[PDB]
Amino acid sequence: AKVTVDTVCKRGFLIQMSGHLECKCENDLVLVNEETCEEKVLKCDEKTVNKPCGDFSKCIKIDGNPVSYACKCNLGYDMVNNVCIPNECKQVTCGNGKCILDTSNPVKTGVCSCNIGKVPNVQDQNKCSKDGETKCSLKCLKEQETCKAVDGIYKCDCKDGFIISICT
Amino acid sequence: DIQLTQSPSFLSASVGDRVTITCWASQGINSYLAWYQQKPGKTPKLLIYAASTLQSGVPSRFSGSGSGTEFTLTISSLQPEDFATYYCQQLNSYPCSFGQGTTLEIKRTVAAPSVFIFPPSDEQLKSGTASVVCLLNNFYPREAKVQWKVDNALQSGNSQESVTEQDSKDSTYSLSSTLTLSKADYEKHKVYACEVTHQGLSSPVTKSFNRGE
Amino acid sequence: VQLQESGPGLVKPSGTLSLTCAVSGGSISSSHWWSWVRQPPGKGLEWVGEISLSGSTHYGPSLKSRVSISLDKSMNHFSLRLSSVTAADTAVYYCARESRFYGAYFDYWGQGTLVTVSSASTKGPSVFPLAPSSKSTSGGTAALGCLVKDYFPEPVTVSWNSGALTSGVHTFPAVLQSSGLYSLSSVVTVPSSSLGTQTYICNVNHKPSNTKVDKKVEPKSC
């Protein structure tokens, strides 16, 4: 469903931007859903149908003679810049941010969620160009971690006086 | 379903004036309200979405405001080319709906019409019908009285008017009035006169011709 | 990206209206949703229906089971079909690309095509000159035009000198005569000094009858 501060990212971790939270996968894993990561198959064949080949994409059989196998985005997504994004985000550019879904209305619609420090700018097609502060909501319950701004996103990381599996 | 209602239906303001159109939704739609500009018989143009987000390529004098069931479209400094019908639109839940439209006329100083009259072509007379065309050119406001007199006899029921949309440069109107007669009735009279009454004329102006000259 | 409607402009009552929207300068897969909007004469905008790239359709409830919309991804177009039409379906039909970024709206539209519902037959127009004279000259400006009379159905396109003359042109909206045929006039104001040098031709084009007529307007010296 919708990722919150209480979502348990299976084989991933929580990140926060200006208008949403989402799970970020570990290693070279890919998203099978909003809160689950798995290994990515490298070649789609009859042995890898339905297995994940990317974020919100899995191998599927394509009809025809001869039949083929390819990495296709899940229902509700399409391939844009080699990544599966929601249909509502197809022609969307957010700037220093991401296009996410607003699902609060019967008609789902795409909005922008920005890197920490920016908010959508009504004077710039709602792109992530306006300065704005975002308070971090992450619960970094590990006794040695706190919320830090890493590469423009909020993320539980080692505190100001520790480094790297426990933060020590 | 969600019905949209705009107020007012018609609006007349001058160049440089600030105008505000109101759109009411029958139930809340958050900020997901769009605005369109449509010149008469032309393609609608998206101006604003998300109540106040200006679409690329739209002049900054356009702005929007509102959330829930009440929204406003504002043009901060009216320009002559801003005359159009403006529609709000929502698709927060099916079905999609529009407002009934607000027509915006550009108000300007009174301009008297230049009146021309056109006799029927000899090529049309060969077909048994005679059309006499009276032309009122570049005037404001749109209200005008155009009467046909045939040997100073007032006509009735044999004429039709057509008025152009406002000009996007000088905000004036042009009007054509066409008197239609048969060839026999047309050749039964001599003087064909167009009489024009307008606010920019201290007295009614008459443009006429003698049939055959 | 360009949107262009096309299809018959005259449908007999209870017949089927059929229009196609061709997308050029870009793919129809640039957006996932596409819609049809119509505008009856003198009335406001009405949402007719919508289709997605996956084939999902939504229609205006007023149209009931008379409306259908298809899409052909390979042909880069999508179509509209309206059955059992009445005069209430006479309207200019637009196609529109949908954007669902902070709402759901129409960011790209087509030219719009008119479809008149009537049992009257198609009739091409007669074009008569509105010759300039002393009765159409004010200042240094002379007015001349063309009378486009007795045609059905709408619309006609009027140009001057094959589109080379546009400034000063006024093509009046057509009036519906008592005979059931339309009529309009297209006038243009030009420098009266040029009436001996420059020739003026109006090009009247009636697509429903596939008739194009060119009338040279000769200047009167009276």
Author numbering:
A (entry chain I): 1 to 164, 169 to 172
B (entry chain C): 1 to 213
C (entry chain D): 2 to 35, 35A, 36 to 82, 82A, 82B, 82C, 83 to 100, 100A, ...
From the paper:
The TBV candidate antigen Pfs25, which has been tested extensively in human trials, is a glycosylphosphatidylinositol-linked protein expressed on the surface of ookinetes. Pfs25 is important for ookinete survival in the protease-rich mosquito midgut, assists with penetration of the mosquito epithelium, and aids maturation of ookinetes into oocysts. Comparison of the structures of Pfs25 in each complex to the previously determined Pvs25 structure 13 showed that Pfs25 adopts a similar overall structure as Pvs25, in which four distinct EGF-like domains assume a triangular arrangement and disulfide-bonding patterns are conserved. We delineate the atomic structure of Pfs25 as recognized by six mAbs covering two distinct regions defining functionally important epitopes.
